[PDB]
Each structure stands twice: as C-alpha cells, then as structure tokens.
Design an enzyme around this catalytic site. Structure first.
Site, PDB file in Angstrom:
ATOM      1  CG  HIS A 121      29.504  49.815  33.093  1.00 43.65           C
ATOM      2  ND1 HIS A 121      30.539  50.154  33.681  1.00 43.65           N
ATOM      3  CD2 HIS A 121      28.674  50.884  33.085  1.00 43.65           C
ATOM      4  CE1 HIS A 121      30.813  51.412  33.801  1.00 43.65           C
ATOM      5  NE2 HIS A 121      29.521  51.790  33.600  1.00 43.65           N
ATOM      6  CG  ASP A 132      32.219  39.983  33.067  1.00 45.64           C
ATOM      7  OD1 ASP A 132      32.055  41.133  32.829  1.00 45.64           O
ATOM      8  OD2 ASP A 132      32.696  39.181  34.178  1.00 45.64           O
TER       9      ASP A 132
HETATM   10  O1  LIG Z   1      35.624  41.003  47.132  1.00 47.56           O
HETATM   11  C1  LIG Z   1      35.810  41.838  46.077  1.00 47.56           C
HETATM   12  C2  LIG Z   1      35.357  41.417  44.817  1.00 47.56           C
HETATM   13  C3  LIG Z   1      35.604  42.213  43.801  1.00 47.56           C
HETATM   14  N1  LIG Z   1      36.109  43.346  43.968  1.00 47.56           N
HETATM   15  C4  LIG Z   1      36.458  44.405  42.941  1.00 47.56           C
HETATM   16  O2  LIG Z   1      35.159  44.437  42.283  1.00 47.56           O
HETATM   17  C5  LIG Z   1      35.343  44.632  40.822  1.00 47.56           C
HETATM   18  C6  LIG Z   1      34.465  43.546  40.085  1.00 47.56           C
HETATM   19  O3  LIG Z   1      34.405  44.030  38.532  1.00 47.56           O
HETATM   20  P1  LIG Z   1      34.559  43.023  37.396  1.00 47.56           P
HETATM   21  O4  LIG Z   1      34.336  43.885  36.137  1.00 47.56           O
HETATM   22  O5  LIG Z   1      35.464  41.833  37.488  1.00 47.56           O
HETATM   23  O6  LIG Z   1      33.005  42.218  37.619  1.00 47.56           O
HETATM   24  P2  LIG Z   1      31.664  42.706  38.092  1.00 47.56           P
HETATM   25  O7  LIG Z   1      31.417  42.579  39.642  1.00 47.56           O
HETATM   26  O8  LIG Z   1      31.354  44.225  37.515  1.00 47.56           O
HETATM   27  O9  LIG Z   1      30.450  41.898  37.250  1.00 47.56           O
HETATM   28  C7  LIG Z   1      36.928  44.525  40.596  1.00 47.56           C
HETATM   29  O10 LIG Z   1      37.433  46.044  40.527  1.00 47.56           O
HETATM   30  C8  LIG Z   1      37.349  43.871  41.985  1.00 47.56           C
HETATM   31  O11 LIG Z   1      38.729  44.376  42.103  1.00 47.56           O
HETATM   32  C9  LIG Z   1      36.538  44.004  45.273  1.00 47.56           C
HETATM   33  O12 LIG Z   1      36.770  45.179  45.497  1.00 47.56           O
HETATM   34  N2  LIG Z   1      35.954  43.225  46.369  1.00 47.56           N
HETATM   35  O1  LIG Z   2      25.189  47.318  42.047  1.00 47.97           O
HETATM   36  P1  LIG Z   2      24.916  45.936  42.553  1.00 47.97           P
HETATM   37  O2  LIG Z   2      23.605  45.213  42.018  1.00 47.97           O
HETATM   38  O3  LIG Z   2      25.404  45.404  43.814  1.00 47.97           O
HETATM   39  O4  LIG Z   2      26.009  44.926  41.482  1.00 47.97           O
HETATM   40  C1  LIG Z   2      27.076  45.396  41.220  1.00 47.97           C
HETATM   41  C2  LIG Z   2      27.582  45.761  39.791  1.00 47.97           C
HETATM   42  O5  LIG Z   2      27.499  44.590  38.989  1.00 47.97           O
HETATM   43  C3  LIG Z   2      27.815  44.975  37.625  1.00 47.97           C
HETATM   44  O6  LIG Z   2      29.314  45.441  37.601  1.00 47.97           O
HETATM   45  C4  LIG Z   2      26.761  45.925  37.057  1.00 47.97           C
HETATM   46  O7  LIG Z   2      27.164  46.380  35.629  1.00 47.97           O
HETATM   47  C5  LIG Z   2      26.880  47.159  37.933  1.00 47.97           C
HETATM   48  O8  LIG Z   2      25.820  48.078  37.230  1.00 47.97           O
HETATM   49  C6  LIG Z   2      26.637  46.722  39.280  1.00 47.97           C
HETATM   50  O9  LIG Z   2      26.778  47.958  40.308  1.00 47.97           O
END
Ligand SMILES: O=c1ccn([C@@H]2O[C@H](COP(=O)(O)OP(=O)(O)O)[C@@H](O)[C@H]2O)c(=O)[nH]1
Ligand SMILES: O=P(O)(O)OC[C@H]1O[C@H](O)[C@H](O)[C@@H](O)[C@@H]1O
Length: 454
Positions: free
Chosen positions: A151, A363
């Site tokens: 991812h 990202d």
């Molecule tokens: O308070 C929050 C912040 C983020 N998200 C969700 O978390 C995901 C974040 O995915 P993204 O690919 O932008 O970044 P990541 O956290 O995976 O690096 C998205 O679906 C947002 O809608 C959520 O549900 N609540």
């Molecule tokens: O699972 P956490 O350590 O809370 O991070 C939340 C997420 O961040 C990114 O989306 C990573 O690609 C995921 O593998 C991970 O689950």
C-alpha cells in the site's frame, strides 16, 4: 475459492488508515476471511485467535505479545520500513534484534493462519509488515495461491539500499505468486532493484503483469492503484449536508472560505510544509486574511514512537506561530484538531470545503484525496490541491499538482484554488469523477484477483 485477506491492521469490529478502509470496501462485496492483528497488546499470557462472522466476512484476529509488538511493529515495520519506503532515511533506525523478531512474528502469524486454510483458498497479503509472509507460509507446507499488495510506495532501489536487510526482504517478496504495487513508478523501482541489485530480470507480457526472475524464483508483478466507491462517498457527503458537524462548521466560518485537510499526524504527510504554505498565503495576500480558515484534522497515529511525538511537537509549534501572527479577536486562521472523526462526518465536511489540501511528502496513494473529490457537490465543487508525490496524482488530472517542498508554489496553488471560477472547478471535478468511477475499488480487487488466479 474463498478470499483470505491478511494484514496487520484489521478494520474495527473510527480508525484512521486507508488500508483498513480500502480492504474492507473490497472484501464486503465478495465476502471471505480477514486475518490479522486485533490491535491489542498483551503484557502476559498467550495470544488466542478469535474467529467471528460479521455478515459475509469472517474476522480472525489475534493479539501481539509486548515483545512481538515492540520488535515487529514498533521496531522493524515502523522504525525501519515505514521511514525508508517514504524516503526518510534520516529517520530510519535499524536494530538486528528487531529485524529477527519481525521475521519471527511473520512466521508465528503464518502458523496461526495455517489451521484455518482450505485447499482452494486464495491468500492475499497486504502491506510492509508482512513481506516475509509467503515465504513463511510455503515453509509451513501451504500450496495455495498467495499474492501481495504494497500500500505504501516502493522506494527507488538506491533508497532501499539504506535498509540493511534489503536483499532478504526482496528475496522474500519473490516467494509470492503475484506482487502488486500502487503505481507504475513503484513497479519500476521494484524492477530496478531486481535488475541492478539482485542480478535478476523483469520482462513484459501480453497478459499484462511483468514476469520476474530472481533468486531462482519465477513470479509476476504489476501495478494496481487502489480506489474508492466515489458515488457512495458522494451520497454519504450529501446525506450529512444538514447534520450538526456541517451546520456548526458553517456557523463558525460565517462565510469565510474553508481549506480542509485530513491526515494521520505522520511525518510522511508534509504537514509542516503545508502549514508554512498557508502562512505564506496569508503573508502575501492581505485580502485572504479573515476571509479563509484552514481546518487540519490530524488524528494521533503510532503515538508511542518518539519520531511521531517529534513531528507532533513540530506541527503544534507551527500552528501556534501562524495563529499568533495572523489571528484577530474573531478569527483563528488554523483550526488544528488532534482527534479522529467518523468517515461519514469527514465526507459531509469535505463537501463544504472550497479547497481539499492534500500534500504528503510521499504517499502510496492517499484515499483522502479521492474521498475529497468524491464528496463534492457537482453543482458547486471545491478544488483539490495535491502533492505530485501522492500515488493518486498519477490519475487525478483535475487536481492542482504541487511539489510540497516549494512553499511559494503551494501558496500559489491555494490562491488559485480559492479563486478558481465555477466552470473550471466543474470541468476538473467531472474528469476526476470519471476516473474514480472507472477505476473504483471493486475493479481494483477484481483485477488483482484475476491476475493472481491466472
Ligand atoms: O479521523 C479520520 C482520518 C482519516 N480517516 C480515513 O482514513 C483513511 C486515510 O487513508 P489515506 O490513504 O489518506 O492515508 P493513510 O492514513 O493510509 O496514510 C481515509 O479513508 C480517511 O477517510 C478516518 O476515517 N478518520
Ligand atoms: O495500522 P496503523 O499503524 O495504525 O497505521 C494505519 C495505516 O497506515 C497506512 O495506511 C498503512 O499503509 C497501513 O498498513 C496502516 O494500517
């Protein structure tokens, strides 16, 4: 065949993280099993798997021992792999003992999965925590098809060389039947390592995926950009248009325009540069003062790690400086909130934001960018300002693409977004919705599964 999803983070049975969101969107349609970490850490005793049916999905989750959590997750996964793959070798830490535990926990987790498998199950492993998983499964006698999807970005081979066990990691990747990366540059970086550091080969195919030959193994590799359900997000955003969060947000702004960001408070998200470009906007455009506010929702993430504590401290000082310089008795320029929100509330708020401000330094995809666009009212859509280093920039042509290092460039993009005329905002939104619809999360899942079974 039954689809077995394997990941570290498993959807809650609100959490910030796009893996859990995207995988659950994909899995709920086909049904199957989701195996992974329960999210709990044990000080003593023995972890025990918990199997539970939630509609068409069977969740199979297990706690981690404290030592396993420290070595595998806080250690190698998030202190070595996460910074390295996000081009932050300066933040990379490496400990041989943590790397060994990372390898050991992968084998232990694979052992927990084996008794639940069936002969025709198809196994799909997700993300950097679980790079050794196919190798462990095969050593345990597993013969099922096994795919992997990363991812996060796959870094340039020269950057991956900073991870001391890079060769063992890439060799372990070659035990998968199929490797999936987010974007074409991710796949190119993988092939560059194979050819130039592993003495292997990468060959095109008429089927689509490349054929990889390396470490005596033969496998396939391709790019599969994860998507969303854009019309589902739109309906969700519309359904909240008279809800309390939108109503109170509107009242608080009283006609000021809204720049909105939503990011785990991760150093990968370029939040300091993002704040500095909003400050630069205010420095150069007096007409913007008291006429716009910047909502940054920045939920805690990985908070027991010093590096995440550090970036939090840096960002909080930024918000204090910028608010102190430009605030008025009735105006707080940056609304910084260090809390998680329901995804349904974020969608409703996205629809009220004139600018979606998504500028990660690196990202793998960034679902928030796709969600922001999807939430918009097509009659009056906002503008996405998007880092060229988000994987979503490879497909979202209607965004204003920026380099986050360029503070002036990002500020100029904010000004352009805020003043963009309706017809052009609509044309950009229309084009992006077509892209998001044709390349939605169901298509992504079907494409990967088609290649894995073929
Ligand atoms: O308070 C929050 C912040 C983020 N998200 C969700 O978390 C995901 C974040 O995915 P993204 O690919 O932008 O970044 P990541 O956290 O995976 O690096 C998205 O679906 C947002 O809608 C959520 O549900 N609540
Ligand atoms: O699972 P956490 O350590 O809370 O991070 C939340 C997420 O961040 C990114 O989306 C990573 O690609 C995921 O593998 C991970 O689950």
């Amino acid at each position: 065949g039954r689809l077995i999803i394997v990941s570290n983070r498993v959807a809650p049975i609100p959490a910030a993280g796009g893996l859990a969101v995207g995988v659950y969107d994909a899995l709920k349609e086909t049904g199957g099993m989701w195996f992974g970490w329960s999210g709990d850490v044990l000080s003593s005793g023995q972890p025990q798997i918990k199997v539970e049916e939630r509609g068409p999905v069977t969740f199979a989750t297990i706690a981690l021992m404290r030592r396993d959590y420290d070595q595998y997750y806080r250690g190698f996964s998030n202190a070595t792999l996460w910074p390295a793959f996000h081009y932050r070798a300066d933040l990379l830490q490496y400990d041989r003992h943590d790397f060994e535990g990372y390898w050991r926990v992968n084998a232990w987790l694979a052992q927990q999965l084996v008794p639940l498998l069936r002969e025709d199950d198809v196994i799909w492993v997700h993300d950097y925590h679980l790079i050794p998983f196919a190798q462990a499964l095969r050593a345990a006698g597993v013969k099922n098809r096994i795919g992997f999807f990363l991812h996060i970005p796959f870094p340039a081979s020269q950057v991956l060389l900073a991870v001391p066990p890079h060769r063992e990691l890439v060799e372990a990747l070659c035990s998968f039947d199929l490797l999936g990366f987010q974007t074409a540059p991710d796949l190119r970086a993988f092939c560059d390592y194979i050819v130039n550091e592993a003495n292997g080969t990468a060959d095109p195919s008429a089927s689509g995926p490349l054929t990889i030959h390396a470490f005596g193994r033969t496998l396939r590799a391709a790019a599969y950009p994860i998507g969303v359900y854009p019309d589902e997000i739109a309906e969700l955003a519309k359904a909240g248009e008279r809800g309390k969060p939108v109503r109170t947000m509107k009242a608080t702004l009283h006609s000021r325009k809204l720049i909105m960001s939503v990011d785990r408070l991760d150093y990968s998200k370029g939040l300091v540069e993002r704040f500095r470009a909003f400050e630069r906007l205010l420095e150069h455009s007096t007409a913007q003062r008291n006429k716009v506010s910047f909502l940054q929702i920045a939920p805690p993430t990985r908070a027991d790690m010093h590096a995440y504590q550090d970036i939090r401290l840096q960002l909080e000082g930024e918000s204090g400086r910028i608010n102190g310089r430009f605030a008025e008795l009735d105006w707080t320029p940056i609304l910084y909130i260090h809390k998680q929100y329901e995804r349904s509330v974020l969608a409703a708020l996205f629809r009220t934001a004139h600018v979606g401000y998504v500028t990660p330094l690196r990202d793998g995809m960034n679902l928030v960018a796709k969600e922001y666009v999807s939430a918009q009212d097509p009659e009056n859509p906002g503008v996405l300002v998007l880092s060229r280093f988000a994987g979503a920039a490879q497909e979202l042509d209607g965004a204003l693409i920026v380099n986050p290092v360029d503070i002036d460039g990002m500020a100029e993009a904010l000004a352009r977004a805020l003043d963009m005329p309706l017809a052009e905002r609509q044309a950009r939104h229309r084009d992006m919705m077509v892209q998001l619809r044709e390349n939605n999360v169901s298509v992504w899942r079907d494409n990967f599964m088609r290649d894995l079974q073929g």
